[PDB]
């Protein structure tokens, strides 16, 4: 049994507390990067993070993209999305397959 963590502002990711998810709120880059890194070291399974937080710390995210755990998944906030997560798909597609299937 592994664990689940959530990163985002209060008004968006607060209800996730009702599931036992480790829900924290980082605003600075160093705060998010540290939390994610400690989540990985204490064996968290999945880390859902808003795109308004993931945009601040991209270097740390791609560091775990090649690892089995944790899985870092970009969810939107109430305001919406930055379109990063759906473009990171395209980033992985073109890196492997040269032409478009989408």
């Amino acid at each position: 049994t592994y664990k689940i963590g959530v990163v985002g502002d209060k008004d968006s990711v607060s209800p996730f507390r009702l599931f036992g998810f480790d829900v924290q709120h980082g605003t600075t880059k160093t705060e998010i990067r540290k939390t994610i890194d400690e989540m990985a070291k204490n064996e968290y399974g999945v880390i859902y993070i808003t795109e308004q937080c993931a945009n601040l710390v991209p270097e740390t995210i791609e560091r775990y993209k090649g690892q089995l755990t944790p899985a870092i998944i970009l969810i939107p906030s109430h305001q919406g999305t930055l379109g990063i997560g759906l473009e990171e798909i395209q980033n992985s597609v073109e890196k492997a397959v040269g032409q478009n299937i989408l």
Partner: protein
Amino acid sequence: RLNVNPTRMELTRLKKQLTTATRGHKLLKDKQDELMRQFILLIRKNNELRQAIEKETQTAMKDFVLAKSTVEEAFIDELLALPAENVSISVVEKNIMSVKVPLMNFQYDGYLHSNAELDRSIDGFTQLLPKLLKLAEVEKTCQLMAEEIEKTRRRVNALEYMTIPQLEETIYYIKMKLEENERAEVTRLIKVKNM
């Protein structure tokens, strides 16, 4: 060209490595082609799932934002972390062409005043939970697959442009070098025999 001992022992050793490199070259391109064919199927559901999740999650969030606006702030703060339910994950390891792929499944172990509108937003997050899970499963599957495709492709390019040509050219240099020195020693032995 590689830098190594121009010996008979090294020559015979390098030539067998060339044979190893050539078969492994194709073994990777069969590995790459069939790793990517499935990658197409996986990435299609990835885009289909994320675009689905990114909208159900948003509406449920804004609904919560709007609902909590009419309710007192202090009430919400204490309602949260009731919990009263604990949800965790159970990761199984599945193989897709020599690639570690995560198999995730949900594992388990609300105040009277939860407004109807609030409840609509609260179970709206509970309605989301199974779909967010396989988004995590598929994406990580695709991420761990794309890196493998990168590694395979990059290794293939290394095998074809760097490894084998250096190997062929070294097997040619040492082979000719041995052929030259033998001609030299034999020639020397000819003069000695006359003595």
